[PDB]
Amino acid sequence: PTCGAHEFQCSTSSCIPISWVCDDDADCSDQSDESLEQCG
Amino acid sequence: YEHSTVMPNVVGFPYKAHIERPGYSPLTLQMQVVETSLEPTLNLEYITC
């Protein structure tokens, strides 16, 4: 299930907007958005 | 936040007061009278032996 071009996929396969990535908010249930590897 | 209450003068009675601010969650206080003492005022009259 590939998310849209403006959406990010958490490791639980959930889709969140790209603008929510590394925003210091735990949008993904598993904190995949705030993961250190993705944020660099 | 000013408040007022009335509590009994019984030693060891666990009085509980409820404070309900409209903007905050309610709070409960516990006040207990451990010990009292009544002090009169004395005037010495004389001494007998």
């Binding site: 889709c15 907007p17 | 409209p22 903007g23």
Partner: protein
């Protein structure tokens, strides 16, 4: 944009003070995650965000 259906509004606390003294909660049903432009249609209450 997300499709919002069955949106209800409830207020937790209100206090007409100079600062933002009102907490508002919305219940809704949606299909996707996104961003909505929230506005109030009267000048009796001013939103913060």
């Amino acid at each position: 944009a997300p499709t919002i259906i069955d949106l209800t509004c409830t207020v937790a606390t209100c206090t007409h003070s100079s600062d933002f003294g009102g907490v508002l909660t919305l219940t809704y049903k949606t299909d996707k995650n996104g961003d909505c432009s929230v506005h109030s249609h009267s000048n009796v209450a001013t939103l913060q965000e």
